[PDB]
Amino acid sequence: RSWRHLVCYLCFYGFMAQIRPGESFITPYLLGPDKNFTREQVTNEITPVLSYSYLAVLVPVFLLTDYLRYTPVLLLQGLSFVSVWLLLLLGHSVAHMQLMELFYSVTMAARIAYSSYIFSLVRPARYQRVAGYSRAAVLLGVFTSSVLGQLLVTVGRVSFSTLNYISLAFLTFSVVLALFLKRPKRSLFLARMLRELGDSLRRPQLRLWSLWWVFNSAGYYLVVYYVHILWNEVDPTTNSARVYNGAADAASTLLGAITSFAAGFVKIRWARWSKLLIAGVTATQAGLVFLLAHTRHPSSIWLCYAAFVLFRGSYQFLVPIATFQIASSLSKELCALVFGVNTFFATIVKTIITFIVSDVRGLGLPVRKQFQLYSVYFLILSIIYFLGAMLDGLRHCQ
């Protein structure tokens, strides 16, 4: 009876908080007529500040989430989103947008805390069903946010400036409703850790999937950060409505959901050979990335959207398998630490790559050549994994 209130309230909060009408339209608004921002500045100054900031912020955020009850950190994330949107609304030059990027990274770092809070608060007896409901609610919220943001403009035909105010309104409702969720009762953060790490390191499947997580995720995220900019380069906005950036995000979310659902049905069956699956998926990703890099004609923008949605979907299909193979080794007590370290390594590799191939004081290539380099990178990863599979087969052939 009483428990119904809390179990519904958590899902409601998650769904409402996921709403952000202008998140998918952030890049077109920066290069919109109101703001005098050139493409070279958007991809060399503003986009690289976010990656550096993420690397600097990820560790303290995760370390502090435990010391404070999870509610303070969730509130901090909700308010940091408000700060980001305020900076975007009143951005006046490159420095302000950098500050905005720094703040955005801060919101990004605390995104993972929500699941841990869900686990800590909900009673263990009824944990699985509640967690499933919460994941469904948050995924539905993410899916509907972009759909609303894009259907407001595409048929409503409102300006970009209005969209930011309308997004700020919901962003304020999110923080207002993020204030009354009850605090976790008790979650306060040792040879056991050392022994567990030593034992876990021996499993080879864990090694392989951890390496894939370190590299392919870094490569995937880099493509995601600058893809919007490439889209803007391909076709300037003749009208503010012909842009379908939000539609692509909604389609990508739907494809990711449907393919992740498929993954769980073959998590064990296809575990007999994993290197071959990795090689195939990475080869398809490399092909799609190259096609994105070489698509130039204005009348092929729909094709570019299709390529990106396929690319994002393909990567999403391979996340559940990695998570399942990694998690089974040890209980949830150490799974969080393993994922944190792995994600921290996936943030250092990205930081080193991006500084060299994106920001000034380096190559500083424009978007097109940067995507060509990313295509070569993915193809090299595919080659490495294909050769590893060939070696393993040479073992099985004899």
Please give the backbone phi and psi of residue 32, each rounded to the nearest 5 degrees, phi first: -75, 165
**Resolution (in Å) of the shown entry?**
3.3
Q: Name the token pair of 261.
A: 């659902």
Q: Is 323 annotated as a binding residue?
A: yes
| Alpha-carbon separation of residue 294 from 244, 288, 301, 364, 372 (angstroms) | 20, 10, 12, 19, 8
Nearest Cα to Cα of residue 17 among 207, 165, 179, 185? 179
Residues 213, 349 within the same domain? yes
Measure the CA–CA gap between 218 and 343, rounded to whole angstroms: 9
Nearest Cα to Cα of residue 231 among 288, 287, 296, 153? 296
Nearest Cα to Cα of residue 54 among 354, 364, 365, 362? 354
Q: Name the token pair of 177.
A: 């409703």
Please give the tally of structural domains in the chain: 2
**What angle do the packed helices 204-234 and 191-201 form, to 10 degrees?**
80
Q: Is 272 annotated as a binding residue?
A: no
| Sign of the four-CA dihedral 119, 122, 123, 126 | negative
DSSP 140-209: HHHHHHHHHHHHHHHTT---HHHHHHHHHHHHHHHHHHTSSSPPPS-----HHHHHHHHHHHT-HHHHHH
Residues 183, 199 within the same domain? no
Q: Yes or no: say if 247 and 305 are a contact pair by the CB < 8 Å rule.
A: yes
Nearest Cα to Cα of residue 140 among 19, 285, 10? 19
Measure the CA–CA gap between 169 and 140, rounded to whole angstroms: 20
Q: Name the token pair of 232.
A: 């803007």
List CB contacts of 194: < 8 A, sequence separation 6 or more: none
Residues 80, 176 within the same domain? yes
List CB contacts of 246: < 8 A, sequence separation 6 or more: 24, 25, 146, 147, 149, 150, 151, 153, 154
Q: Yes or no: say if 244 and 305 are a contact pair by the CB < 8 Å rule.
A: yes
> Is 292 in a helix, a strand, or coil?
helix
Q: Is 225 annotated as a binding residue?
A: yes
Look at residues 189, 216, 235 and tell me which one is the last residue of a structural domain.
189
Q: Is 115 annotated as a binding residue?
A: yes
> Is 36 in a helix, a strand, or coil?
coil
Q: Is 260 annotated as a binding residue?
A: yes
Phi-psi region of 183 (alpha: psi -120 to 50; beta: other; left: phi over 0): beta
Q: Is 26 annotated as a binding residue?
A: yes
Measure the CA–CA gap between 116 and 127, rounded to whole angstroms: 12
Q: Is 112 annotated as a binding residue?
A: yes
∠ Cα 91 95 98 (to 5°)? 85
Q: Is 339 annotated as a binding residue?
A: yes
Q: Yes or no: say if 210 and 346 are a contact pair by the CB < 8 Å rule.
A: no
Please give the backbone phi and psi of residue 381, each rounded to the nearest 5 degrees, phi first: -60, -45
Measure the CA–CA gap between 77 and 60, rounded to whole angstroms: 14
Q: How far apart are the first and last CA of the chain?
A: 63
Look up the domain containing 311 and give its range: 190-398
Measure the CA–CA gap between 321 and 317, rounded to whole angstroms: 8
Residues 34, 151 within the same domain? yes
Residues 81, 223 within the same domain? no
Nearest Cα to Cα of residue 113 among 283, 295, 339? 339
Residue 291: how many other CB atoms lie within 10 Å: 17
Measure the CA–CA gap between 57 and 107, rounded to whole angstroms: 10
Q: Is 77 annotated as a binding residue?
A: no
**Helix, strand, coil share of the chain (percent; to 5):** 80, 0, 20
Q: Yes or no: say if 102 and 40 are a contact pair by the CB < 8 Å rule.
A: no
List CB contacts of 343: < 8 A, sequence separation 6 or more: 58
Measure the CA–CA gap between 114 and 120, rounded to whole angstroms: 10
Measure the CA–CA gap between 88 and 26, rounded to whole angstroms: 9
User: Looking up tokens 């990106």, which residue turns up?
Assistant: 308
Q: Is 101 annotated as a binding residue?
A: yes
Residues 119, 203 within the same domain? no
Residues 359, 251 within the same domain? yes
What amino acid occupies position 160?
A: F
> Is 21 in a helix, a strand, or coil?
coil
Q: Yes or no: say if 162 and 153 are a contact pair by the CB < 8 Å rule.
A: no
∠ Cα 101 55 22 (to 5°)? 30
Q: Is 165 annotated as a binding residue?
A: no
Q: What is the CATH number of the domain that holds 1?
A: 1.20.1250.20
Phi-psi region of 364 (alpha: psi -120 to 50; beta: other; left: phi over 0): left
Q: Is 312 annotated as a binding residue?
A: yes
Measure the CA–CA gap between 152 and 21, rounded to whole angstroms: 9
Residues 213, 321 within the same domain? yes
Residues 105, 150 within the same domain? yes
Q: Is 349 annotated as a binding residue?
A: no
Q: Yes or no: say if 13 and 173 are a contact pair by the CB < 8 Å rule.
A: no
Q: Name the token pair of 152.
A: 């407001």
> Is 111 in a helix, a strand, or coil?
coil
Q: Yes or no: say if 41 and 330 are a contact pair by the CB < 8 Å rule.
A: no
Residues 335, 225 within the same domain? yes
Residues 69, 199 within the same domain? no
Measure the CA–CA gap between 236 and 118, rounded to whole angstroms: 43
Residue 52: how many other CB atoms lie within 10 Å: 17
Residues 342, 215 within the same domain? yes
What amino acid occupies position 61?
A: V
Measure the CA–CA gap between 48 and 210, rounded to whole angstroms: 25
> Is 347 in a helix, a strand, or coil?
helix
DSSP 193-230: HHHHHHHHHT-HHHHHHHHHHHHHHHHHHHHHHHHHHH
